Ligand binder design. Structure first.
Ligand SMILES: Cc1cc2nc3c(=O)[nH]c(=O)nc-3n(C[C@H](O)[C@H](O)[C@H](O)COP(=O)(O)OP(=O)(O)OC[C@H]3O[C@@H](n4cnc5c(N)ncnc54)[C@H](O)[C@@H]3O)c2cc1C
Length: 453
């Protein structure tokens, strides 16, 4: 139990009621430091621990693909916490109003939440802090090394963040203790009813094709903590050996496919790292996978934590802002509207095929995501519009959307964040360029296009 994983958000007088875990980013019962630290405080206070999840009003800004994935996993989580005598309460509305009301009604003694550097999470914290008088703690349950401990500033490159993260691995990469159940039963609606009403509200905005048929295919990834562990086990046994060799081939399914589970926190990345470290596979493919799930994943939290404007043009490096400004008035080859990007109606068949994998599966290949966003910058009127369009289609149709990985991934493609300067071209400036012929020399672009008609 490392005290560097927990941070105090507000001091106060501890009540004599249950310890409340405001779960948000990490929706899992196992390998949850936030839940484990809440249980330890409750045990030392001779009081039970309870879980409170908030069903926010911002769900209509996404889709059914994300609403169903999250709520189906929360239904499985409700049973898991019930087996540990840990009751869960699912509130509907503003977190600033619901959490403050729950704390006062249930005589909460201490409040704990998990860590997320997103702007919307800091908005909820500001509202909750003003409405409570009990101690308020937060715990980094998503990163192996706490985001405030890995680096005290923003790291501009992966080769500067890698030696800092690996130096702290022997301290923070440890096994998880077992979640002790409550000593006894500690004495607001059914999730199935909340899913039915929310789906009916999202139905008019459902992504459809010409035949009025749904575009999304929900049989590619089954939600839940149990289905997440099966994906990890199958990846280590079948795909890890060839990961470093075929991670850049969109025609092969050699990725772990763990991001939808990782985003909603249905599986701990620290658990995935532990099982991969003890696995005996290709040393080149192991170094490649640990680079993505540790460095690039946690450098995205570093970027969002230390950059308030992580979604804006001001967070770009000075060399990128000066390069893009010098080419702002360059006549773009094409200018597509948001509705043309959304429906995949560009002159690039490779770009259209990437958008149809996004629309149909909700998880577009990691390599084509780089090409998909860089073409948005090439076919937009300004880098600012390219950011809005990329963020919109990302958060709406990706299952792992609305994640620090997405904003840091978009900043890398459009603004060269965590990148270097390259050959100066028109429109795109010194931002790294990915051409269509360059992709034809890396993989079979025809098979990727034909798969997503
Ligand atoms: C423009 C763009 C947008 C993206 N949007 C998202 C997004 O909204 N949500 C999201 O989770 N990822 C996003 N990615 C990052 C990355 O593509 C995905 O994490 C990865 O594709 C997830 O699929 P996977 O788990 O099968 O990949 P794997 O190769 O199996 O990697 C495993 C995990 O490592 C992490 N990871 C891998 N690559 C990256 C990366 N480049 N940056 C950060 N973490 C990484 C992921 O958590 C990933 O789940 C985006 C990338 C780009 C270029």
């Amino acid at each position: 139990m490392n005290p560097k994983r927990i941070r105090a958000l507000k001091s106060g007088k501890q009540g004599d009621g249950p310890v409340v875990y405001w779960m948000s980013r990490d929706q899992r019962a196992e390998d949850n430091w936030a839940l484990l630290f809440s249980r330890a405080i409750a045990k030392e206070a001779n009081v039970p621990v309870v879980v409170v999840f908030c069903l926010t009003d911002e769900f209509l800004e996404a889709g059914i693909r994300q609403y169903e994935f999250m709520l189906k996993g929360l239904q499985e989580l409700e049973v898991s916490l019930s087996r540990k005598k840990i009751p869960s309460f699912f509130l509907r509305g503003d977190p600033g109003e619901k959490i403050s009301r729950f704390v006062k009604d249930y005589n909460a003694g201490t409040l704990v939440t998990d860590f997320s550097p997103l702007r919307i999470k800091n908005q909820w914290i500001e509202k909750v802090i003003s409405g409570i008088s009990i101690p308020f703690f937060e715990v980094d349950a998503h990163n192996v090394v706490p985001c405030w401990e890995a680096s005290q500033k923003h790291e501009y490159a992966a080769h500067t963040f890698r030696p800092k993260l690996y130096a702290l691995l022997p301290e923070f990469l440890e096994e998880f203790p077992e979640l002790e159940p409550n000593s006894v039963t500690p004495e607001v609606e059914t999730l199935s009813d909340v899913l039915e009403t929310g789906v009916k509200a999202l139905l008019p905005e459902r992504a459809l094709l010409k035949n009025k048929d749904p575009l999304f295919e929900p049989w590619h990834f089954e939600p839940g903590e149990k289905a997440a562990k099966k994906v990890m086990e199958s990846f280590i046994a079948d795909r890890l050996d060839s990961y470093g060799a075929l991670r850049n081939d969109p025609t092969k399914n050699m990725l772990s496919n763990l991001s939808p589970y990782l985003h909603f926190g249905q599986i701990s990345s620290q658990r995935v790292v532990l099982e991969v470290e003890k696995a005996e596979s290709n040393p080149g493919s192991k170094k490649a996978f640990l680079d993505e799930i540790l460095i690039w994943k946690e450098i995205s939290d570093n970027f969002c934590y230390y950059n308030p404007g992580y979604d804006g043009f001001e967070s770009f490096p000075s060399w990128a802002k000066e390069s893009l400004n010098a080419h702002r008035n360059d006549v773009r080859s094409h200018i597509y509207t948001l509705e043309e990007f959304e429906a995949g109606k560009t002159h690039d068949p490779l770009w259209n095929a990437s958008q149809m994998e996004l629309l149909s599966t909700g998880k577009m290949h990691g390599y084509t995501r780089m090409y998909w966003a860089k073409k948005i910058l090439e076919w937009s009127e300004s880098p600012e519009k390219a950011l809005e369009i990329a963020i919109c289609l990302n958060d709406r149709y990706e299952l792992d959307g609305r994640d620090p990985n997405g904003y840091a991934g978009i900043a890398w493609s459009i603004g060269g964040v965590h990148d270097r300067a390259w050959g100066e071209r028109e429109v795109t400036g010194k931002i790294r360029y990915m051409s269509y012929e360059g992709c034809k020399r890396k993989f079979d672009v025809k098979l990727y296009i034909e798969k997503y008609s």
